[PDB]
Amino acid sequence: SDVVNVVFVDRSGQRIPVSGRVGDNVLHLAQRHGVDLEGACEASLACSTCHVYVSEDHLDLLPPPEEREDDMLDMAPLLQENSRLGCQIVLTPELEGAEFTLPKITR
Ligand code: FES
Numbered sequence: 001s002d003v004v005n006v007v008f009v010d011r012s013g014q015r016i017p018v019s020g021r022v023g024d025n026v027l028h029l030a031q032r033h034g035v036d037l038e039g040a041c042e043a044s045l046a047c048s049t050c051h052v053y054v055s056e057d058h059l060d061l062l063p064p065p066e067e068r069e070d071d072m073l074d075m076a077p078l079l080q081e082n083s084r085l086g087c088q089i090v091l092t093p094e095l096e097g098a099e100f101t102l103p104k105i106t107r
Pocket residue numbers: 027038039040041042043044045046047048049050051072085086087088
């Protein structure tokens with residue numbers, strides 16, 4: 001299959017299951033499904049508005065962050081060990097069941 005199921009957890013705590021596809025950008029997918037994850041810099045590693053928390057079980061299956069991602073995340077409110085920039089995440093079968101939680105506050 002090319003299907004990759006994920007769940008967005010919105011800022012109110014509502015879980016929003018989404019049937020994505022391999023190769024989908026997590027930011028763009030969220031926006032297609034009415035999830036208020038905004039990407040101020042249009043996926044150019046120059047903001048942190050796309051900040052999400054990734055389920056711990058899937059965090060180590062993602063590409064290691066670029067130094068610019070670390071720089072942007074360091075500026076983000078409510079940073080966690082499992083924080084990533086959503087625009088840097090592309091769906092693969094390894095992210096089946098991954099949960100992307102929107103932080104309460106954005107920069
Ligand atoms: S949209 Fe700006 S870094 Fe992700």
